[PDB]
Coordinates of C-alpha atoms in Angstrom, one line a residue:
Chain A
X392 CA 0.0 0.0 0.0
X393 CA 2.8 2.3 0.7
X394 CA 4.8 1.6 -2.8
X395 CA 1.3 2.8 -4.4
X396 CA 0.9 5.7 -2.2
X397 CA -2.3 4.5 -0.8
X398 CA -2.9 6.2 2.3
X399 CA -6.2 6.2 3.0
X400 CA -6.5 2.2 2.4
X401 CA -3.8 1.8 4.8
X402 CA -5.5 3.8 7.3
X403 CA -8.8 1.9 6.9
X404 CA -7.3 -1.5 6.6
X405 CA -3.6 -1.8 8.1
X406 CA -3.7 0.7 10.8
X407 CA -6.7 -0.6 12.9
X408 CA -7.7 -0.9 16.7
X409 CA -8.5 -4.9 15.9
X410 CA -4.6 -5.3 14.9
X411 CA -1.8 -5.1 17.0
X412 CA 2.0 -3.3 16.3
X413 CA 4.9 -1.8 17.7
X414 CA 7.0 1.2 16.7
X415 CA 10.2 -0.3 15.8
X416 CA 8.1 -2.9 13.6
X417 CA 8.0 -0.2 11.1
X418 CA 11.3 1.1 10.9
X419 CA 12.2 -0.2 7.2
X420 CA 9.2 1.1 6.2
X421 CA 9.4 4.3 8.0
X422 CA 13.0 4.4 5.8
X423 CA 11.5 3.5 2.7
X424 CA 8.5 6.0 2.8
X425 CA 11.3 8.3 3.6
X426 CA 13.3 7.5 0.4
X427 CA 10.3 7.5 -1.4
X428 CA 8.7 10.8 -0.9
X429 CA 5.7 9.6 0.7
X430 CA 5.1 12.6 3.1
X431 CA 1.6 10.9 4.2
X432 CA 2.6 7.7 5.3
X433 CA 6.1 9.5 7.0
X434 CA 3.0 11.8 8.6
X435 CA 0.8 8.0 9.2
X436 CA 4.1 6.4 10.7
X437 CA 4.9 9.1 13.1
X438 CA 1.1 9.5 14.4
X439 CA 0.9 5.4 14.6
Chain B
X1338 CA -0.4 11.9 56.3
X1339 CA 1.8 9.1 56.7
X1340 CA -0.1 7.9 59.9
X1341 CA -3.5 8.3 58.2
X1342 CA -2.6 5.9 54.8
X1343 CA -0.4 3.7 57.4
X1344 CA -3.8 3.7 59.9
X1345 CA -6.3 3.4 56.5
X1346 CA -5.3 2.1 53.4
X1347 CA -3.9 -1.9 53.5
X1348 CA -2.3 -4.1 51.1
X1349 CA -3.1 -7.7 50.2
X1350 CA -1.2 -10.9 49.3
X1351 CA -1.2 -14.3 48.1
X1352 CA -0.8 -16.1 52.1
X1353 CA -2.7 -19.7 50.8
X1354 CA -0.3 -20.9 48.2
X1355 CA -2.6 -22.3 45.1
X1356 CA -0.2 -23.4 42.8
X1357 CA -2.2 -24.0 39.9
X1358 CA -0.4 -27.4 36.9
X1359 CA -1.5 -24.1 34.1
X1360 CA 0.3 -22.1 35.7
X1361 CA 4.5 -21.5 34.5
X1362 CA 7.1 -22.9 37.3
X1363 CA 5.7 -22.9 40.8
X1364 CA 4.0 -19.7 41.9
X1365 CA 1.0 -18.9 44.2
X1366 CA -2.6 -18.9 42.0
X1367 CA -2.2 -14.7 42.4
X1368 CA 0.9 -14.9 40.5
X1369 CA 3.9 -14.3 42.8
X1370 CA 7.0 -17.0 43.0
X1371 CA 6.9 -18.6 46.3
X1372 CA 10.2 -17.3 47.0
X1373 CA 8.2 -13.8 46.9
X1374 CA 5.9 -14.2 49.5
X1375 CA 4.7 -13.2 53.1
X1376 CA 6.2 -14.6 55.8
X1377 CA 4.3 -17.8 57.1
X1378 CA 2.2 -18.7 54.1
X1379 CA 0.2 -21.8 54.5
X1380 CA -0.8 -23.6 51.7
X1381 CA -4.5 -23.9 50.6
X1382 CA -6.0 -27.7 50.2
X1383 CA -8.5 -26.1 48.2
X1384 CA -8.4 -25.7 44.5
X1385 CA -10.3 -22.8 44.3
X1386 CA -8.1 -19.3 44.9
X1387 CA -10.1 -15.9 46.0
X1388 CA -9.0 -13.1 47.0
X1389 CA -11.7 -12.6 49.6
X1390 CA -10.6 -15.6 51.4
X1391 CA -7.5 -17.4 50.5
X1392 CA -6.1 -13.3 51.1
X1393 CA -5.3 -11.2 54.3
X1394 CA -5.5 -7.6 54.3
X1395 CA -2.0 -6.0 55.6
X1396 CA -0.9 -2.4 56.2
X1397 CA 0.1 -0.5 53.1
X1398 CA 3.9 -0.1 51.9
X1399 CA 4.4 1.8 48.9
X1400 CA 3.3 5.2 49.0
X1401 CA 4.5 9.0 48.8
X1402 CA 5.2 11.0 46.7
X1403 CA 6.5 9.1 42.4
X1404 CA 9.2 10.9 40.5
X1405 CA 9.5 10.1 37.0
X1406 CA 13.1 10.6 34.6
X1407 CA 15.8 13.0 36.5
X1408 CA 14.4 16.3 37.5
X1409 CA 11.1 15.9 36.1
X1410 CA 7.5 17.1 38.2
X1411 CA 7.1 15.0 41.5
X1412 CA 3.7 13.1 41.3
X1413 CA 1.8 11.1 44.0
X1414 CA 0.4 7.4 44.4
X1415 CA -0.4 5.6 46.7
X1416 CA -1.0 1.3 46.9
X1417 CA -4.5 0.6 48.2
X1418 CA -6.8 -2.3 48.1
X1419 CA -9.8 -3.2 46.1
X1420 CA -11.9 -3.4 49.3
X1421 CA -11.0 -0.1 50.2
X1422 CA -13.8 2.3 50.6
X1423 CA -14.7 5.4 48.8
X1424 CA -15.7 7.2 51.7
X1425 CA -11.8 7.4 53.2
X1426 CA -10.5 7.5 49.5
X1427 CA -11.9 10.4 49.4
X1428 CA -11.0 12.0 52.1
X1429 CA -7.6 11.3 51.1
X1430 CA -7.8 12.8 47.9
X1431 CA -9.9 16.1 49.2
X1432 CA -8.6 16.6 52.9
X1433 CA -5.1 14.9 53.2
X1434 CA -3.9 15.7 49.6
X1435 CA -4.9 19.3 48.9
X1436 CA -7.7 18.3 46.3
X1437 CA -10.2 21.1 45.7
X1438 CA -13.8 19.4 45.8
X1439 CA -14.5 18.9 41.7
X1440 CA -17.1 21.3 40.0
X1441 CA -17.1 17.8 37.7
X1442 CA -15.3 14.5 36.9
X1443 CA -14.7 12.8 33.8
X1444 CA -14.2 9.1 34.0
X1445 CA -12.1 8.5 30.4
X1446 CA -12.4 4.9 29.9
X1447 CA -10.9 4.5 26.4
X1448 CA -8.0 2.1 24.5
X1449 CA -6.0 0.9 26.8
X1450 CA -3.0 0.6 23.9
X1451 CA -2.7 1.6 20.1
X1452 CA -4.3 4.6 20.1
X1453 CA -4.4 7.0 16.7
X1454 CA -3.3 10.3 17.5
X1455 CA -5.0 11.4 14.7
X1456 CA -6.4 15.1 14.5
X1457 CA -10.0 14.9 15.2
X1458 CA -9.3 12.8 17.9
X1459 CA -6.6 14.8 19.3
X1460 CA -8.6 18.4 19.2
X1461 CA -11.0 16.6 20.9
X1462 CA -9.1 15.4 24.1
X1463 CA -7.3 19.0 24.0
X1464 CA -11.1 20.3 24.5
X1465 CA -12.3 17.6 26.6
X1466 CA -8.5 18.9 29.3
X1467 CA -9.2 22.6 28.5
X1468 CA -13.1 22.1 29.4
X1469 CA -11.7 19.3 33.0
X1470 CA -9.1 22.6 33.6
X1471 CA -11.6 25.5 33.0
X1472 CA -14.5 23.9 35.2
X1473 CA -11.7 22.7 37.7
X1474 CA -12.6 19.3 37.1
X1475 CA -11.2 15.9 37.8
X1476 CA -9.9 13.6 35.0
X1477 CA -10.0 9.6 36.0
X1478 CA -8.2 7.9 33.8
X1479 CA -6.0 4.6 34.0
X1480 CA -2.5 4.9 35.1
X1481 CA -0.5 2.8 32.5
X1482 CA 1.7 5.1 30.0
X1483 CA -0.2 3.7 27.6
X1484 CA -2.1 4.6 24.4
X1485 CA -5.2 7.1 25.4
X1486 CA -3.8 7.7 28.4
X1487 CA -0.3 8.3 27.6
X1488 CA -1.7 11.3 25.2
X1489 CA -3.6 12.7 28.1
X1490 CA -0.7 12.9 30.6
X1491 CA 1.1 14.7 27.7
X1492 CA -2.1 17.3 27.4
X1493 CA -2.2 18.1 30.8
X1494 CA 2.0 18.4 31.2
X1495 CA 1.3 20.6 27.9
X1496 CA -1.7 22.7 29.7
X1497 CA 0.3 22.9 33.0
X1498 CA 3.3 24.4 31.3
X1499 CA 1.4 26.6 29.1
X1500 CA -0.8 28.3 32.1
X1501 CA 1.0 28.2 35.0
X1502 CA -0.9 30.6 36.7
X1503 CA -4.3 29.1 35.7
X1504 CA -5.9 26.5 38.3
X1505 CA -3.8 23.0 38.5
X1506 CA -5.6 19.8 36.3
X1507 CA -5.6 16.9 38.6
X1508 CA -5.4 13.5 36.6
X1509 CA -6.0 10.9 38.3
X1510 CA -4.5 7.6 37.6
X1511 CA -6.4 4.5 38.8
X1512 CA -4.4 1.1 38.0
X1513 CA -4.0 -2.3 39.3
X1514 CA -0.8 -2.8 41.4
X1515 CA -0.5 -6.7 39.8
X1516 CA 0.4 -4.5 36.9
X1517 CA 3.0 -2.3 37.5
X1518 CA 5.8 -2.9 35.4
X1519 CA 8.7 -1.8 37.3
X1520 CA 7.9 -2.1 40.8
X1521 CA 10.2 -2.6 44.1
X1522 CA 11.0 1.1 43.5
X1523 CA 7.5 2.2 44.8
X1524 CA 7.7 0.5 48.1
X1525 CA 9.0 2.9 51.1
X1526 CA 12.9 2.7 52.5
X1527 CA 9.7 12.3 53.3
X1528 CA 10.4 9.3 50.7
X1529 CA 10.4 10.2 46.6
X1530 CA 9.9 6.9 44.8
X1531 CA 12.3 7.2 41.1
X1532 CA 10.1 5.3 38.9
X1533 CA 12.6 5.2 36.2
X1534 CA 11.2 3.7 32.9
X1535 CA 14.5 5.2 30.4
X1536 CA 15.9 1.9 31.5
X1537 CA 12.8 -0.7 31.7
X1538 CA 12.9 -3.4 29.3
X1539 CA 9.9 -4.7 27.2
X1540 CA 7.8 -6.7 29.8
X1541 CA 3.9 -7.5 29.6
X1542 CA 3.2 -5.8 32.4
X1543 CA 2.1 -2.1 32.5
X1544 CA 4.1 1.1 33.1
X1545 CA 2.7 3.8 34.9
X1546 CA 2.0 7.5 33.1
X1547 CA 4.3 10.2 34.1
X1548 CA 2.4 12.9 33.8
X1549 CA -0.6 12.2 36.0
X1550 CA -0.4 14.0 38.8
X1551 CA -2.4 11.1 41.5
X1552 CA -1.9 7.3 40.7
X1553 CA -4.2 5.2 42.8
X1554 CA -2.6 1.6 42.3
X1555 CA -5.5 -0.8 43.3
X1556 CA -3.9 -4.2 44.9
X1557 CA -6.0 -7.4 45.2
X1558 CA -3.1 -9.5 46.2
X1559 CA -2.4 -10.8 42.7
X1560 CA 0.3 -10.6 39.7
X1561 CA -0.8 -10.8 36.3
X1562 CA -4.5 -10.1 36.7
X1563 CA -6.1 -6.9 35.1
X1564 CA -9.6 -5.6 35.2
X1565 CA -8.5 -4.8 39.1
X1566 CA -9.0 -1.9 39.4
X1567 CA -12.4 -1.5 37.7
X1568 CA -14.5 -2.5 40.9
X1569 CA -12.7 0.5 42.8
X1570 CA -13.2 3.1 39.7
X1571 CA -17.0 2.0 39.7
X1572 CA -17.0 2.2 43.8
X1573 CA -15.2 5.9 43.9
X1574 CA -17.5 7.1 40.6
X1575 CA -21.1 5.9 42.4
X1576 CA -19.5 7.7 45.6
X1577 CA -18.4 10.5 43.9
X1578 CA -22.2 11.0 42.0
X1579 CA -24.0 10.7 45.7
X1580 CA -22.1 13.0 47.4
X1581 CA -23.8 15.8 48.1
X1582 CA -22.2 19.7 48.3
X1583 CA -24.0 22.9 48.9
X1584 CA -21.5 24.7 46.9
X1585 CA -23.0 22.8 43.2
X1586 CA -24.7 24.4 41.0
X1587 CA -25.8 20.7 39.7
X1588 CA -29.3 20.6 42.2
X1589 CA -26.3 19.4 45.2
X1590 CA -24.3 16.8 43.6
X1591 CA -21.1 16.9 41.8
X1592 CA -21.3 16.0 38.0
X1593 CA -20.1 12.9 36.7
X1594 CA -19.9 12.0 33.0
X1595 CA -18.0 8.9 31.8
X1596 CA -16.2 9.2 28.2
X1597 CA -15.9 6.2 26.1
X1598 CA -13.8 5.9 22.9
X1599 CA -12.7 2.6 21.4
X1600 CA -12.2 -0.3 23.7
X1601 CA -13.0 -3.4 24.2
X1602 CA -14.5 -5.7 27.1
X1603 CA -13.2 -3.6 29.6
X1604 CA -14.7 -0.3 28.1
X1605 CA -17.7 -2.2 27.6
X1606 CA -17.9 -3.2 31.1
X1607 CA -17.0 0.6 32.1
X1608 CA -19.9 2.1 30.4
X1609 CA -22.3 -0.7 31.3
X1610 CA -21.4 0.1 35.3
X1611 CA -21.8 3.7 34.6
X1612 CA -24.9 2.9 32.8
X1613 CA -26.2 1.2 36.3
X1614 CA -25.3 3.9 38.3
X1615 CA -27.1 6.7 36.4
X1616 CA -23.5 8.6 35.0
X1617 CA -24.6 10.0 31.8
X1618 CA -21.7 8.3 29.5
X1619 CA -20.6 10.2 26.5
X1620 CA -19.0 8.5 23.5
X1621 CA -17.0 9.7 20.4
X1622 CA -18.1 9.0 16.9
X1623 CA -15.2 7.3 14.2
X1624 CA -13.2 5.7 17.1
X1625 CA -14.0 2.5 16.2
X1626 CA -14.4 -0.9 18.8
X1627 CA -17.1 -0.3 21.4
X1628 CA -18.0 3.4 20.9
X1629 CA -19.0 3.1 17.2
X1630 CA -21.0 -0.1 18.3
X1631 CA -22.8 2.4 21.1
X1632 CA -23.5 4.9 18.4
X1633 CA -24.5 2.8 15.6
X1634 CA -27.0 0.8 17.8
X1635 CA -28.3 4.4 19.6
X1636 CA -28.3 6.1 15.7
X1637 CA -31.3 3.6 15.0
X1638 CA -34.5 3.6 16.6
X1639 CA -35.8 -0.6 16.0
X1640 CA -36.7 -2.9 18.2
X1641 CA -33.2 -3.7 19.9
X1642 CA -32.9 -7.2 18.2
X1643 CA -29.9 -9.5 19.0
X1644 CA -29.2 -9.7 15.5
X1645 CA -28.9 -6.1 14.7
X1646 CA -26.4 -6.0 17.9
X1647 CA -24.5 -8.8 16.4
X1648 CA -24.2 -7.1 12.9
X1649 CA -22.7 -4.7 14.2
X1650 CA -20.5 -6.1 16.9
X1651 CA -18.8 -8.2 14.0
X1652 CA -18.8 -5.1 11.8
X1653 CA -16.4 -3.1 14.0
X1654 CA -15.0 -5.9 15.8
X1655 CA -14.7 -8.9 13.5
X1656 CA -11.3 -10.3 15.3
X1657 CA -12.7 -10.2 18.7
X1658 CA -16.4 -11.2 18.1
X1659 CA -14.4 -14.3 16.3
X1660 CA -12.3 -15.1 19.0
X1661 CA -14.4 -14.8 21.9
X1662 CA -16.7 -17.9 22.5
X1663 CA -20.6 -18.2 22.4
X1664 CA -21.1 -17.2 26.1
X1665 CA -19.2 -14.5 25.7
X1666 CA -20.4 -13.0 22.7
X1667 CA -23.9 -13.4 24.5
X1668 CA -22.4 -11.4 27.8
X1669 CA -21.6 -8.5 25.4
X1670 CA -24.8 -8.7 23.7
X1671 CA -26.6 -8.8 26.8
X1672 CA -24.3 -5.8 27.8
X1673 CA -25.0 -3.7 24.5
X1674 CA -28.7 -4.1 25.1
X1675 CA -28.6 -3.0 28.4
X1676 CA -27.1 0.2 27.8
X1677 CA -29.4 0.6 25.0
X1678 CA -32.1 0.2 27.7
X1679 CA -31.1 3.5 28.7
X1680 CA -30.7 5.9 25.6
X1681 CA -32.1 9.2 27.4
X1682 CA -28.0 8.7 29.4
X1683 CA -26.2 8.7 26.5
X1684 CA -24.5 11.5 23.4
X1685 CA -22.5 11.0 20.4
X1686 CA -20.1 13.0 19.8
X1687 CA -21.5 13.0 15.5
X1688 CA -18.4 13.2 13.1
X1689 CA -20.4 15.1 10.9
X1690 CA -20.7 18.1 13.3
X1691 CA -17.1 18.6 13.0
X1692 CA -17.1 22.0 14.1
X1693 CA -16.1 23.9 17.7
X1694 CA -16.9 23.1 21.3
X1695 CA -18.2 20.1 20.3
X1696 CA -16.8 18.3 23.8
X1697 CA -18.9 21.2 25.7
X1698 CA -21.7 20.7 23.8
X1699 CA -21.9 16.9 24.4
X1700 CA -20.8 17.3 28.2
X1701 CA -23.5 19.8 28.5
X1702 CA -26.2 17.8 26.8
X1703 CA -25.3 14.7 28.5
X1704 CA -25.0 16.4 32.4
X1705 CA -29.1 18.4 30.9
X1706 CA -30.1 15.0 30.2
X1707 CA -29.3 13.5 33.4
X1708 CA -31.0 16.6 35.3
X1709 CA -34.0 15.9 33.4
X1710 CA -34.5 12.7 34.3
X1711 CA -34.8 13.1 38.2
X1712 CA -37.1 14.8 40.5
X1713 CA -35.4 18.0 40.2
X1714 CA -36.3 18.5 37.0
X1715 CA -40.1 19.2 38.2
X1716 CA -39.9 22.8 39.5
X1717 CA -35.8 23.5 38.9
X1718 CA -37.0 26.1 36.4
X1719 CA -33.6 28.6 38.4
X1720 CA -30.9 25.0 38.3
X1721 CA -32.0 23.9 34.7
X1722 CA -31.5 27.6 33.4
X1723 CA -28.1 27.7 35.5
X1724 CA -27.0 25.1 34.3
Chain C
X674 CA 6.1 23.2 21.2
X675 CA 3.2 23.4 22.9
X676 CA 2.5 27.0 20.5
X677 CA 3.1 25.2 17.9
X678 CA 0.3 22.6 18.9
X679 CA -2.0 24.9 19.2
X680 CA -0.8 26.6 15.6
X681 CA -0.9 23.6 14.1
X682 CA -4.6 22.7 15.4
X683 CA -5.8 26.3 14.4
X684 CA -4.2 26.0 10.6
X685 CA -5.9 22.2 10.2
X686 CA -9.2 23.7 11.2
X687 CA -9.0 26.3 9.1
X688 CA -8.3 24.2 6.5
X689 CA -11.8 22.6 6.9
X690 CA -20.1 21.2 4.5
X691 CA -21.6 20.7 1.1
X692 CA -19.6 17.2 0.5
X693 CA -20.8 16.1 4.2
X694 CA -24.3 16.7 3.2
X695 CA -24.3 15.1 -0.1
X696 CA -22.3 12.3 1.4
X697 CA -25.0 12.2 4.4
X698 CA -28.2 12.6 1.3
X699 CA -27.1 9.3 -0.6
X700 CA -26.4 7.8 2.5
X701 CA -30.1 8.6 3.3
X702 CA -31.4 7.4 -0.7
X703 CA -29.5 4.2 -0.1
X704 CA -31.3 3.4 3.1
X705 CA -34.5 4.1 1.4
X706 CA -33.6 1.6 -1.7
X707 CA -33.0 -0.9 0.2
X708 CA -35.9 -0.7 2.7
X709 CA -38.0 0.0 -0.2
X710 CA -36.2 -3.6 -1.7
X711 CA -36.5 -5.3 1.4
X712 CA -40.2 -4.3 1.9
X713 CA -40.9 -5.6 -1.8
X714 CA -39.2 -9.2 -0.9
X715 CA -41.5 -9.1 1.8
X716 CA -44.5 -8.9 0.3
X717 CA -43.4 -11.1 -2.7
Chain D
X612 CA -33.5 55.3 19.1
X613 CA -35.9 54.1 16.2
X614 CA -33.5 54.8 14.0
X615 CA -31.3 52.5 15.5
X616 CA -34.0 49.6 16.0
X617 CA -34.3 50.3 12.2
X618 CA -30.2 49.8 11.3
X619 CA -30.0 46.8 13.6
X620 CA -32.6 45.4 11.6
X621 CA -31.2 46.1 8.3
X622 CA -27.9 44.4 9.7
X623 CA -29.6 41.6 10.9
X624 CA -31.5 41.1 7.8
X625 CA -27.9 41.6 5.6
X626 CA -26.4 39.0 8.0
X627 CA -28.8 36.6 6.8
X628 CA -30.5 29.4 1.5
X629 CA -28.2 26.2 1.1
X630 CA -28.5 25.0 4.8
X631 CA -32.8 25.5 4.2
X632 CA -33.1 23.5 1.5
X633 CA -30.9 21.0 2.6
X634 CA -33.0 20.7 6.2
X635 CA -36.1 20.6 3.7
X636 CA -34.4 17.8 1.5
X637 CA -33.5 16.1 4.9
X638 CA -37.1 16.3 6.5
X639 CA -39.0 14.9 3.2
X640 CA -35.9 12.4 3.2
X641 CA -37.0 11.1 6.7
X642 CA -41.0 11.6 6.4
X643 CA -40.7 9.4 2.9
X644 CA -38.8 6.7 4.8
X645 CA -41.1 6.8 7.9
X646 CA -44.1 6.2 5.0
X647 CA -42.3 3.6 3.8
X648 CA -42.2 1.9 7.0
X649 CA -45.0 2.1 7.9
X650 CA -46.4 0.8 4.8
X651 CA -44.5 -2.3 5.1
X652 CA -45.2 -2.9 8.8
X653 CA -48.7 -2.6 7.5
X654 CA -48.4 -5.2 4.5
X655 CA -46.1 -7.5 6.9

């Protein structure tokens, strides 16, 4: 979802109360949103 | 003070040892290793561990005054037990800890972990501590430094450094001592407890918020167990709505409203309680879990059918509703209806009106609602219109 | 930071109507299709 | 005194469409689907 820039799927379907995660489980993909220019999913990340 | 918590508050612990085959290496049925236990602790030939029985009741030991990282704002807590009554509780917090009476309380009973700090979300918990600091009221909210709560200890510290002059937000923090992540710091050698948490590793027990300013760890003698503390939130809350002050402009009483927002069975057992004990609850639209449950089911006006309840249980919570068993998704339904049974004690906070003062308008509704419904409401033409 | 906050709150909601209410009017049309569907099983 | 009863009129009246005929299309919205309703309860 984040390769396709597909925030608001992510938000309705990844990032959910029903599923469970922790903050360094997203490092990489903190990194590669970074690399990527995906300023809404750096924004998603930091918020989650 | 000292002599009043030593002479009022007590502690419990596992003395029958109920070493349970479940259980992982040898400890007591509360939790605790026998090597960590009171001094002359018989062993149970019963089966069956309770902690109304199989526990004795002992003076308290960890108390005073919590400190939190290196020279950050002292806090206070105190380990108390879930017998405990409200009535001394109270005086504690009023008389022997400089409490102001509240002019309201808010009982925020939301996700206990992975919370969305999300912007609708946050403005409305920056409104919801603005409104608790403007009417000088109480926030009761859980202790751990976790999710929802976590945010709100950071809005108050953020409220208390922009307005230092302004009246002081109390927060208080009621957890379960069988939770307490790292503990043997809060027990006594006046005395400044360092909960340091810079250092704590990744364990699955809670760790308390730094910014609340009371923490009110409720012990039941166990290790392990949450829901502890809820029976002691419910107690202080039904305590806190009878109590009776000429100085209210609520007809005498001090207003109580309970905020939901997310959740699960715990939440759902929080607004069901408040439910019982006429608290007007008010719950937040788009937050997903329990509260969108709440506001689906009140949003329709049918005849309260199990199936509808069910619908919409496994629409917001498909995982859970899946997990959980057939009793247990009948408990909750049972639960949903019940708080249905009462719709006149209960607003939505609509995502659709999106606009300003929304929190004060749904605190407002929900305390007019509740003043309606009583025998006040008769003649209170003066109390309504003060209100 | 705590300024800032509050900056940042005040520019996000004046950032934010007509899309709400047409989103809320099919909302309402749907509901009425399909109790008028459900209402013609029914009786069929 | 009059005059000024008169020019906080005027102002009020300027002050013063969309929302209207929204609350209109949202009331016939809600009386259709109570009709509906009730004629089904009433087949049923």
């Amino acid at each position: 979802l984040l390769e396709w820039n597909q925030l608001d799927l992510a938000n309705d379907e990844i990032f959910t109360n029903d599923r469970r995660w922790e903050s360094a489980d997203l490092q990489e993909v903190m990194f590669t949103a970074l690399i990527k220019d995906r300023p809404k999913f750096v924004r998603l990340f930091l918020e989650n | 003070l000292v002599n009043f918590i030593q002479a009022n508050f007590k502690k419990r612990e596992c003395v029958f040892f109920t070493k349970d085959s479940k259980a992982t290496e040898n400890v007591c049925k509360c939790g605790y290793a026998q090597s960590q236990h009171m001094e002359g602790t018989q062993i149970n030939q019963s089966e069956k561990w309770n902690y109304k029985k199989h526990t004795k009741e002992f003076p308290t030991d960890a108390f005073g005054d919590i400190q939190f990282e290196t020279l950050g704002k002292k806090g206070k807590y105190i380990r108390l037990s879930c017998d405990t009554d409200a009535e001394i509780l109270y005086e504690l917090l009023t008389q022997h800890w400089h409490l102001k009476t509240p002019n309201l309380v808010i009982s925020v009973t939301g996700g206990a972990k992975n919370f969305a700090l999300k912007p609708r979300m946050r403005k409305i918990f920056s409104r919801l501590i603005y409104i608790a600091q403007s009417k000088g009221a109480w926030i009761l909210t859980g202790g751990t430094h976790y999710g929802l709560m976590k945010y709100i200890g950071e809005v108050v510290r953020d409220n208390t450094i922009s307005r230092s002059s302004e009246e002081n937000i109390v927060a208080i923090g009621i957890a379960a001592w069988g939770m307490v992540s790292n503990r043997d710091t809060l027990i006594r050698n006046y005395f400044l407890a360092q909960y340091l948490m810079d250092d704590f590793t990744r364990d699955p027990l809670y760790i308390l918020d730094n910014n609340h300013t009371h923490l009110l760890l409720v012990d039941n003698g166990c290790h392990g167990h949450p829901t502890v503390e809820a029976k002691l939130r419910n107690q202080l809350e039904k305590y806190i709505s009878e109590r009776t002050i000429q100085d209210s402009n609520y007809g005498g009483k001090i207003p109580i409203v309970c905020f939901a927002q997310g959740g699960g069975k715990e939440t759902l057992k929080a607004i069901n309680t408040s439910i019982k004990n006429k608290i007007p609850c008010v719950v937040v639209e788009g937050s997903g879990q329990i509260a969108d449950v709440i506001a689906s089911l009140v949003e329709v006006e049918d005849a309260l059918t199990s199936s509808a309840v069910k619908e919409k249980l496994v629409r917001f919570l498909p995982r859970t509703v899946s997990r959980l068993p057939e009793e247990e998704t009948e408990s909750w339904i049972k639960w949903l209806k019940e708080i249905l049974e009462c719709s006149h004690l209960l607003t939505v906070i609509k995502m659709e009106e999106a606009g300003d003062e929304i929190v004060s308008n749904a605190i407002s509704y929900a305390l007019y609602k509740a003043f309606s419904t009583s025998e006040q409401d008769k003649d209170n033409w003066n109390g309504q219109l003060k209100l | 930071g705590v300024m800032k906050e509050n900056y940042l709150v005040k520019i996000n909601t004046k950032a934010n109507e007509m899309r709400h209410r047409f989103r809320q009017l099919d909302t309402k049309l749907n509901d009425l299709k399909g109790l008028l569907k459900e209402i013609a099983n029914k009786i069929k």
